[PDB]
């Protein structure tokens, strides 16, 4: 029941090879004076939490700090250019400021150090089957820690030939609901990442990726006077169980 459903061709992704794949982590902390974006203090704590975490999950983790908007695109393009033939998976964490945008496919954008945005739409489409053919039929995860929009949420009271399409196996986990702010303690770190790492510690071995982010969505939703609702844009075909030794 528990262990049997892991090793299944129909219902779950196969993560047999060591390592699973590459794991880019863009961590924009220090922004320029011209943009006026405040320094995202405590994101280095979130960065190193995730860096150890994905390394524990057998990923070739690579942190790139304070990237400008053009370097973010060059960093993401070079990852997509790699030979993912031997690799089973791919992860892209982004820690930065964000904003609302006139989107077509995926909502949200993420700022560079220079202070001009890169849309999540554009970041995901770099890794599609046309552009990156090596990740064909392989899960492509995205964890976007950034603000959805300017709006602060108070909330409400509650009593206590093989057919496979080009945009397949995309998974974009949002830290906050589109059009709302992502919260962060300067000392502790982001609510999203703090809760993500804690839940990934306790429940990575037994539960799949979707089940993990349900706990993150629940744990983050109870927090604070101002509210935050994490979620994800799931386009996966199978369940993604992370490998641990």
């Amino acid at each position: 029941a528990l262990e049997s459903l892991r090793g299944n061709a129909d219902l779950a992704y196969i993560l047999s090879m060591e390592p699973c794949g590459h794991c880019l982590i863009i961590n924009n902390v220090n922004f320029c004076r011209e943009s006026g974006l405040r320094t995202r203090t405590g994101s280095n704590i979130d960065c190193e939490k995730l860096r150890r975490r994905f390394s524990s999950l057998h990923f070739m983790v690579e942190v790139k700090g304070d990237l400008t908007a053009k370097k973010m695109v060059l960093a993401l393009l070079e990852l997509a250019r790699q030979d993912h033939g031997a690799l089973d998976c791919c992860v892209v964490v982004i820690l930065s400021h964000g904003c609302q945008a006139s989107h077509l496919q995926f909502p949200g954008a993420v700022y560079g150090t220079d202070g001009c945005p890169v849309s999540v739409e554009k970041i995901v489409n770099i890794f599609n089957g046309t552009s990156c053919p090596s990740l064909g039929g392989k899960p492509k995860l995205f964890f976007i820690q950034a603000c959805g929009g300017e709006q602060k949420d108070h909330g409400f009271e509650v009593a206590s030939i093989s057919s496979l399409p080009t945009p397949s196996d995309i998974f974009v986990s949002y830290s906050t609901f589109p059009g709302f702010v992502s919260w962060r303690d300067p000392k502790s770190g982001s609510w999203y990442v703090e809760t993500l790492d804690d839940i990934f510690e306790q429940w990575a071995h037994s539960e799949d990726l979707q089940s993990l982010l349900l706990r993150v969505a629940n744990a983050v939703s109870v927090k604070g006077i101002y509210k935050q609702m994490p979620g994800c844009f799931n386009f996966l075909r199978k369940k993604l169980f992370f490998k641990t030794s």
């Binding site: 011209e34 006026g36 400021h97 700022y111 603000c147 303690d185």
Partner: protein, 165 residues
């Protein structure tokens, strides 16, 4: 009370120089068509805003950042006149933004470079002040609305305990 103001006085309204600079920009903005024509207006505001940001950092000071006990204060050797001259420059930005929003009633999604200067990021210093100015001018605003008083230069905005990002 020395650091900030709750409600706007007669000193906080626009001077004849700022009023004349406002009326010229509003007239040039609406009658212009192409993006090439607005390059004179864009360089004014981006020079003005960068000068306005310097005026804040010279006048004001934020003590005890990233805590619950954050307090705003005026810098050493800086009078109440230096505060009110900044709030005049802050009023200019708000009142200019109002008239640009009036000029953009039809096509309300043009992606204008001049308007994006008056819409800064929600973590920034200027957003805190413009959101504060909007509450005092346009009456309350009613975003959340508690018993707490609004500061017309919000020095403690996004600088304590919980922050955006």
């Amino acid at each position: 009370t020395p650091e900030s103001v709750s409600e706007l006085n007669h000193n906080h309204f626009l001077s004849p120089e700022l009023q004349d600079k406002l009326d010229v920009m509003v007239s040039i903005y609406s009658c212009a068509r192409n993006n090439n024509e607005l390059e004179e207006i864009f360089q004014e505001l981006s020079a003005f805003v960068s000068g306005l940001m310097d005026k804040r950092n010279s006048v004001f000071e934020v003590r005890n950042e990233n805590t619950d006990e954050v307090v705003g204060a005026l810098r050493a050797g800086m009078t109440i006149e230096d505060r009110d001259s900044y709030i005049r420059d802050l009023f200019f930005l708000h009142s200019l933004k109002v008239k640009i929003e009036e000029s953009r009633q039809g096509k309300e999604d043009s992606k204008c470079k001049v308007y994006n200067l008056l819409c800064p990021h929600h973590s920034s210093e200027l957003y805190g002040d413009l959101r504060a100015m909007k509450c005092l001018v346009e009456g309350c605003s009613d975003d959340f609305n508690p018993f707490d008083i609004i500061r017309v230069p919000d020095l403690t905005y996004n600088k304590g305990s919980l922050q955006c990002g």
